[PDB]
């Protein structure tokens, strides 16, 4: 950690006012509340008062202004929408890079309302795949379901949906959430899907999880698997979310130093990079 | 089908994963870099190509007694044709 | 200590190693990378900044653009490469 | 074919090093499938010779050894079919 660091180098020495001193003393309480948010922001702890965060998909169980401020700071500047946008563009890029390998005519950028990113009651479509040949589709299965049973039907247009969630301690199971929301949105009346067949990928940012339960076609399983792996490993927006969370938590994880100038490392001292020994 | 099983597959495996390879041309120059694109006629387009070769002072003292030095140059993006290219090898 | 031998590619590779310069059924190579119009790979912070600038619909200011251009020019100059003046002055 | 990417590289200032050591840097205006580089307002420096500036040049693709493009070349969008 970094005890007494803050955003202003903790501003310990100063001629600060008593109210400012109280605020500085309350900042570590903000860090503690942010740290323990997943286990105290759950509906088991507080009954009722389930209010979604502004322009964000996070629900605030119990009026905790400290946690409200901390989460607003973390998700400043429409970070949820940017994260969802980055994920959808990355998935589209991955699918385009492997277009002809799975008999996909093309991919489609569905017109998405901004709120869709943080719309939990209903949903919409994110990516549309168009085919030159018929796609035989299989019955719904989880992302980890190695064995899938094939459904006796085919399609031409295939939908992919991305749902981001902030799971608390009791509801951090991504697979159950993905399955329930797939079985809800597909059979919903305020959610319109281009085709009955498709895949819904749920991503838990609070715990860094991901799972898909929709209808799958052959060849899409490994592609989606490595796509999710690479998008959890190197997404820019997700990295920014992680960095903001780390800054809010003041988790200054220790890091190692560079290798010393030994008898097998001096050969890089005569390279094009200017190096100096002091 | 046959594009990933021929002799140019080492030129394709280093261009698919953007790996670093060194190509020695007919002018005794070794260009090391990541091949961005290839073709059937070995027209390799690479990025950040470091061309290392051997240079000589060419009788700087007047008696032709000098040692060759390892000269190196850097290019942002290069497009070397497959005519002058002699050999190529990926980095181990 | 290995010079660049004529008609040989192993010597340059050894010098670079010493200098430290180095279902349907398929295995889809899902590779995702961040690049710019200049072709250079972008740091995750830079990629996020570009994405946010494109999403917000407004780019950086003139001063920030000039600073970024100067930094890029300085980086290009540094990556392209006073001893003689110190030897002559001594 | 990589000749189609070089054919779409018109109105670009690039350099081309030949097999005889002559490097000609200029704005390429035309390129066929045989890498016939017709450029305008170029400057060619031969091997152990002084550089000479010409208003127009037509270098053949057979004697062209290598090329050199700047960092503002969109190779990710020009190498597509």
């Amino acid at each position: 950690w970094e005890k007494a660091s803050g955003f202003e180098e903790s501003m310990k020495w100063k001629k600060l006012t008593n109210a400012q001193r109280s605020g500085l003393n309350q900042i570590p309480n903000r860090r503690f509340t942010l740290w323990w948010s997943p286990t105290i922001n759950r509906a088991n702890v507080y009954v009722g008062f389930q209010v979604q965060l502004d322009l964000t998909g996070i629900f605030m169980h119990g009026k905790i202004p400290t946690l409200k401020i901390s989460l607003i700071q973390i998700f400043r500047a429409h970070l949820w929408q940017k994260i969802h946008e980055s994920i959808v563009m990355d998935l589209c890029q991955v699918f385009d890079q492997e277009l002809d390998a799975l008999e996909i005519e093309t991919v489609q950028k569905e017109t998405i309302h901004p709120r869709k990113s943080y719309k939990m009651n209903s949903s919409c479509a994110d990516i549309l795949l168009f085919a030159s040949y018929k796609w035989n589709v299989s019955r719904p299965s989880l992302l980890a379901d190695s064995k899938d049973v094939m459904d006796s039907t085919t399609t031409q247009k295939y939908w992919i949906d991305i749902q981001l969630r902030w799971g608390d301690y009791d509801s951090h199971d991504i697979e159950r959430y993905a399955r329930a929301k797939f079985l809800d949105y597909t059979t919903d009346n305020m959610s319109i899907y281009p085709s009955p067949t498709g895949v819904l990928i749920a991503i838990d940012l609070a715990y860094n999880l991901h799972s898909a339960y929709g209808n799958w076609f052959p060849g899409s399983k490994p592609l989606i698997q490595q796509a999710m792996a690479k998008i959890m490993k190197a997404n820019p927006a997700l990295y920014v979310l992680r960095e903001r969370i780390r800054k809010g938590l003041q988790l200054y994880s220790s890091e190692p130093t560079e290798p010393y100038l030994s008898s097998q490392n001096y050969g890089e001292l005569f390279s094009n990079q200017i190096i100096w020994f002091v | 089908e046959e594009f990933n099983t021929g002799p140019l597959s080492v030129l394709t495996q280093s261009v698919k994963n953007n790996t670093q390879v060194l190509i020695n041309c007919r002018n005794n120059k070794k260009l090391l870099g990541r091949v961005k694109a290839f073709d059937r006629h070995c027209n390799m387009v690479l990025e950040n190509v470091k061309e290392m070769w051997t240079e000589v002072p060419k009788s700087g003292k007047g008696k032709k007694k000098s040692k060759p030095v390892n000269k190196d140059r850097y290019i942002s993006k290069m497009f070397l044709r497959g005519d002058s290219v002699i050999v190529v090898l990926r980095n181990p | 200590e290995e010079p660049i031998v004529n008609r040989g590619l192993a010597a340059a590779l050894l010098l670079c190693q010493n200098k430290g310069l180095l279902k349907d059924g398929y295995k889809p190579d899902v590779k995702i990378e961040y690049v710019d119009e200049t072709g250079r790979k972008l740091t995750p912070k830079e990629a996020f900044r570009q994405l946010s600038h494109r999403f917000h619909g407004k780019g950086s200011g003139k001063m920030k653009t000039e600073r970024r251009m100067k930094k890029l020019d300085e980086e290009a100059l540094l990556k392209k490469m006073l001893g003689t003046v110190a030897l002559l002055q001594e | 074919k990589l000749v189609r990417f070089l054919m779409k590289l018109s109105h670009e200032t690039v350099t081309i090093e030949l097999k005889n050591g002559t490097q000609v840097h200029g704005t390429i205006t035309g390129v066929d499938v045989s890498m016939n580089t017709h450029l305008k307002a170029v400057k060619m420096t031969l091997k152990n010779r002084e550089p000479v500036q010409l208003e127009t040049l037509s270098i053949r693709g057979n004697n062209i050894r290598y090329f050199i493009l700047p960092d503002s070349l969109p190779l990710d969008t020009l190498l597509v079919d």
Partner: peptide, 26 residues
């Protein structure tokens, strides 16, 4: 026997100050 390594443009569509329909442009 060729291979090309090209990145994904991933055109990033506008969110703020659009003045048109709410849904994103294609």
């Amino acid at each position: 026997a060729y291979a090309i390594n090209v990145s994904q443009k991933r055109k990033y569509r506008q969110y703020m100050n659009r003045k048109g329909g709410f849904n994103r442009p294609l």
